[PDB]
Amino acid sequence: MATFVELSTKAKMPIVGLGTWKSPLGKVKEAVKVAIDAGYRHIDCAYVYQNEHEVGEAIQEKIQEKAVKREDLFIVSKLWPTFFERPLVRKAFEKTLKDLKLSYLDVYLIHWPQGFKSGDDLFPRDDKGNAIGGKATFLDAWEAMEELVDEGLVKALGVSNFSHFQIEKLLNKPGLKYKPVTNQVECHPYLTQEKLIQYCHSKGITVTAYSPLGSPDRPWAKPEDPSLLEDPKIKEIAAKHKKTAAQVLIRFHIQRNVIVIPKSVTPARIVENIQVFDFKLSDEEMATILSFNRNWRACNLLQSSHLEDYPFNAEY
Ligand SMILES: NC(=O)c1ccc[n+]([C@@H]2O[C@H](COP(=O)([O-])OP(=O)(O)OC[C@H]3O[C@@H](n4cnc5c(N)ncnc54)[C@H](OP(=O)(O)O)[C@@H]3O)[C@@H](O)[C@H]2O)c1
Ligand SMILES: C/C(=C\c1ccc(C(=O)O)cc1Br)c1ccc2c(c1)C(C)(C)CCC2(C)C
């Protein structure tokens, strides 16, 4: 049973959620069911994961068997950047909600700030594999998303992979109806996001940490790339508490009041990843962990730097 981070809307977002990127069909349903049993109330989803239909099946199953009430679940999905054109925003959302078998989402995020070529090719790219842009912007998309909140289909809106410049562009848009309640970005001891977190918090925006374990199963991983779970200095701290490295990496975010969404389809690990409310990292331990900041991203497979609004060039 998790503590919470309060949003600007006063809604309570569970500080630990379940990630579902690359959760396979046939394992993700069981993953969601084990997580709800273990006390997870926050599930992080996306159109682009192409598994929301199986997540929906699992959620509905657990609501049916009285394991959990809808209003105690916090469901998040994301709009993919091939759907920034107004009518596509609605159609994309409708498929997401249809797949999830829900009547509303708790938060709906812009997945990525750069617009891609519009339509149902989710990864439009040239021969060399660089992304093909579209003319619709994240501001166009936000406009259409705000309707969903007007209609009660989404409780709050958010962003993902935005630098502070792009959040400024959003916050400083004349005639804005709803503000982002969270910015979901990569965060872990090698990418501590100190400036970005400070910025978001000062604007009443929470931060959701993705890839908190360094996404160890990412396909583009080189053995030279650092590994957090195998990091001796992380493992020292885990040992001190007789906890696992994974548990330390998750607890790190909790103690910064940052929401964190570790992904697993392994029942033992799903349970392990929420056993993080019975210990506390000392100040010196937090300081030590923060010192590991390398500014290293597990997640930037996007050959999209040539397009406008690329978020990762900025200092923060
Ligand atoms: N907004 C975005 O752009 C964006 C981008 C990336 C991710 N996300 C979200 O954030 C979530 C989490 O990030 P991520 O999936 O990239 O990587 P991650 O959560 O850092 O790591 C997941 C990997 O670690 C393994 N694992 C999980 N718990 C473990 C434990 N206790 N001990 C050892 N290994 C463990 C998992 O294996 P098994 O699954 O085989 O157990 C999986 O291979 C995603 O699922 C997604 O919902 C969002
Ligand atoms: C994999 C993907 C991005 C992506 C995937 C998952 C998540 C997430 O939230 O977990 C988040 C994200 Br963000 C992507 C985006 C653009 C492109 C590609 C993949 C490939 C590599 C297929 C070709 C080139 C382009 C640039 C079109």
UniProtKB/Swiss-Prot annotation:
Keywords noted in UniProt? Acetylation, Lipid metabolism, Lysosome, NADP, Oxidoreductase, Secreted
Which pathway does it serve? Cofactor metabolism; retinol metabolism
Tissue-level expression reads:
Found in many tissues. Highly expressed in small intestine, colon and adrenal gland.
Q: Give the highest taxon in the source lineage.
A: Eukaryota
* EC number of this enzyme: 1.1.1.300, 1.1.1.54
Reported induction: Overexpressed in certain types of cancers, including hepatocellular carcinoma and lung cancer associated with tobacco smoking.
Q: Which reaction does it catalyse?
A: all-trans-retinol + NADP(+) = all-trans-retinal + NADPH + H(+); 9-cis-retinol + NADP(+) = 9-cis-retinal + NADPH + H(+); 13-cis-retinol + NADP(+) = 13-cis-retinal + NADPH + H(+); allyl alcohol + NADP(+) = acrolein + NADPH + H(+)
Q: Where is this site: Lowers pKa of active site Tyr?
A: 78
Which residues does the Swiss-Prot or TrEMBL record annotate as the active site?
Answer: 49
Effect of altering residue 299 to S?
A: Decreased affinity and reduced catalytic activity towards 4-hydroxynonenal
List the subcellular locations: Lysosome; Secreted
Pull one GO CC term from this UniProt entry: lysosome
Positions contributing to NADP(+) binding: 20-22, 44, 160-161, 184, 210-217, 261-273
Q: PANTHER family annotated for this entry?
A: ALDO/KETO REDUCTASE
What does the protein in this record do? Answer: Catalyzes the NADPH-dependent reduction of a wide variety of carbonyl-containing compounds to their corresponding alcohols. Displays strong enzymatic activity toward all-trans-retinal, 9-cis-retinal, and 13-cis-retinal. Plays a critical role in detoxifying dietary and lipid-derived unsaturated carbonyls, such as crotonaldehyde, 4-hydroxynonenal, trans-2-hexenal, trans-2,4-hexadienal and their glutathione-conjugates carbonyls (GS-carbonyls). Displays no reductase activity towards glucose.
| UniProt protein name | Aldo-keto reductase family 1 member B10
Q: Which organism is it from?
A: Homo sapiens (Human)
